[model samples]
Target chain A: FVNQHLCGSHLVEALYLVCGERGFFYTPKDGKGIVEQCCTSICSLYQLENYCN
Target chain B: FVNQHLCGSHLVEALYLVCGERGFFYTPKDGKGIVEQCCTSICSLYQLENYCN
Candidate 1:
């Protein structure tokens, strides 16, 4: 919900507000990390159907 | 970024694409999970400064 205003071509702010500082490059490393192929991890409002649907 | 269309009010789609199915609830489970206080994992596009700035 808070990530609504975070849209547009320059998702720089939206990315941070949803993903993290690492941006879309977030993921696990050596069995110790987070963010992955998990579609649910994407905190964007446009890809809601992927999870909620 | 690819997460541009990921914005609006729900952010439901964004969360899934950036965070995970568990949604914002995504987090590491005692040495076996992800997501946390780490301000570098919010795949959103409204808060890049915290991680990139």
Candidate 2:
């Protein structure tokens, strides 16, 4: 869970600073795609199902 | 498209700085939830359908 929490916090900062600015307006899906595209290694082990739980 | 690009770039920086550190593994869903939960204002106007186009 530590790993997950760390990732979560980091993402929040990223989204707010970059995407949160006015006139930018990036959606969650866009962020997701970027992760898949940019952070390929992290994408491999990250399971979507484990999130809601 | 400028606004979108700006948002995307900001998000990337934020993600790498905070979440990209070792031992963190946040999924895209987690990032999405953060926005919905944290940035309610942005979420209101962001449409999911408009992303892939």
Candidate 2, residues B1-53: lDDT per residue as tens digits?
Answer: 21232234343343334333221222234345433422332421133222212
- The CA lDDT of each predicted structure is 0.32, 0.32
Candidate 1, residues A20-53: lDDT per residue as tens digits?
3223433223312232322224334544222221
TM-score (all chains, Cα) for each model? 0.19, 0.22
Task: Give one digit per residue, the lDDT tens place, for model 2 in A17-48.
Answer: 33332212222343464344323324222332
Question: Which sections of candidate 2 miss by over 4 Å?
Answer: A1-6, A23-32, A41-53, B1-53
TM-score of chain A of each: 0.25, 0.29
Q: What CAPRI class is candidate 2?
A: incorrect
Candidate 1 lDDT (Cα, 0 to 1) = 0.32
